[PDB]
Amino acid sequence: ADLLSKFDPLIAEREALLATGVRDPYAIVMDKVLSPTEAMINGRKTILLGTYNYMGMTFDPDVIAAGKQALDEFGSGTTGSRVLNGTYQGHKACEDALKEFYGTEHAIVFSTGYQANLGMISTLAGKGDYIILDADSHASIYDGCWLGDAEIVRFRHNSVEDLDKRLGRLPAEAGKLVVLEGVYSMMGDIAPLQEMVAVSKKHGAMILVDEAHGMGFFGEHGRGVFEEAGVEADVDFVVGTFSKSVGTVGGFCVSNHPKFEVLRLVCRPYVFTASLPPSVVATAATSIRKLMHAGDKRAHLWKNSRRLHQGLRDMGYKLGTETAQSAIIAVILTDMAQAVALWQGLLEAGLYVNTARPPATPAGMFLLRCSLCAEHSDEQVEQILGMFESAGRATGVIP
Template sequence: MVDLLDKHRGIAERHKRMMELGVNAVNLVNDRILSPTRGFIQGRETILAGTNNYMGITFDADCIAAGQKAMADFGTGTTGSRIANGSYAMHKELEAELARFLNRKHCIVFTTGYQANLGMLSGLAGPNDTIYLDADSHSSIYDGCTLSGAKLVRFRHNDATDLDKRLSRSEGEGGKLVVVEGIYSMLGDRAPLADFVAVKKKHGFQLLADEAHSFGVLGPHGRGLADEVGLEDDIDFVVGTFSKSVGAIGGFGAGNHPLFETLRYAMRPYMFTASSSPASIATSLAAVKKLAAEPERRARLAANSARLFNGFKALGLELGTDQVSPVVAVKCPDEPTTIMMWNALLQNGVYVNIALPPGTPNKLCLLRCSVSAAHSDAEIDQIIATFGRVVAGRGN
């Protein structure tokens, strides 16, 4: 008999090697969360600098009160999918609020951000179509593409010329969907949207932007990268998540297409899973209203991002991108050094994400920070100082 788990022995051995270095970086437990920027980890109060909590909204009193009221009024869960018994008035209210915020005609809410990409990509493209996806796309995009059954063509990261070349080789007769991200999660770099829009005008395709890390963060209205660069009219479909700037869990897809609502009956990841819980929907709704009403949160995030970026540059660290971004990734020389540095940061009260190949572009080993609007200047300075000490000691 072939043991089905035999194929994972390599993963088990790699995990064992990491544990031998004294860390369990991929299974860390937060004992307590004290605030959007502080928690208790391994018995120590720790600055959280790897949580994607960009707006620092997770402990907002209004959002918490909205969640508590929704749970009291509507119960702990919906016990059904959106197409059965799981659509509540608040789901529709959140979709309407998001559509207003995004300045789109239609919006559909999903239970997680991962499912938003699975649903949108598999609903939009089918076996006769072709999806062109950026090589550094998030796993949810790869998985959504696979679920669609469409022909999949990968283009080099952020390279519109390479996309142009691959579109010129196209053999299919079906529809074409190009997928890019507003901010790429590992390195924090933005898609060169104007270049992609120029290719769109040359070849003709529909364009989807995943604004998971840029929704609420970029642009004068907080709608993402397309808002920042003034190209929203050229984006056919927007995908986003509630697990970052919204501080909850869930995701959405939005667009202006007259048949957009039909996707509700064509997306299996929407149709065949329970809808978001009342508490999650209510906190998301309260948070989206705050994103609209409180632009100072974006300004604070931008200032904090610049402070961390410039502080790391002054230390001579090599970063994932030359543009200020709420994702600040520090490139490290190799896997053992990265693990030792990550561990030293944690022991000195700073939590960041560790990112290792194959989950990173170009086999990079990264210590990935995400900045919050809720970080104080003193916390940002402490993150910088701790990195300085750890880099000087190379993990000691």
């Protein structure tokens, strides 16, 4: 027995699943990517409906040109931390792009969204402080909590009432950080941030909101659900990513707090990692600036999401939301065998979607998760619906 022995049940469970010949969801390789919406998987041309490329920026000609030029002018990488030799003009320019996008006085870029959450949460709340978060918060937010030394307070998923109740029992003078997400990624529903922010401010909490899943398509300027909800002035910190709407890699946190820049000196997941390559901050900056004016993509993203949502429910699928609340649509299934047959059937017909399973989902609930892209054409959305209809009938999920 050694340190990997604790994974023996999982390995055994996996080998037994694979022994039945079913397709492995952990072995999908994009051999070739034709566009933001199509890739070759195992020799088959496949519509991608399981990416977070919400605004189709990954093949934007300006983004790509910026990346190439940065490689020529600045090289493949910085070979240093932001706090030593790794801050190039591109890193500062990218932070300026974020300040303009969010209308904030400060922007700190991290090397991943994971690190942004891990760092912000583990640095802001220390011994004697409390972190109050939704039970179903993203793993990176939890990892922030677990890395730090604060007291953790979980409130029932999506319950303003429970948040308020839980905050009220906490000691008056303890520091409190409420961490919220704009869009809950599992089911693609949105948080009631207006109500939750008001409850949080009433108890004197500082508020950090993750807006990774609404960038470019919620709020007047595309800043996220918090802007749409009208609580921009009451949110202390907004964390996001470069790996979804922006279409590259990286994380960030924006804020108007006058002491915010001090985090560059103390935030360990910022300090003790290399800064991003010049090509990454160039592509990110160019993408971010275009996202400020991407009204056409935004409008088409919403059209796509509403069409797919309405179409799926109309043919008999049960969805995680009564209406399209975001660009994520969750199809709910009650049988594991049925869930795998449908997913595999879709894949073999040329459609890729994501899946979710217990214990990530609650017991007895199996999800197919669809995420729309601004670059899905009207015609592709109709094809997608046709594929769901065909595969759904073949597997007995719908009549």
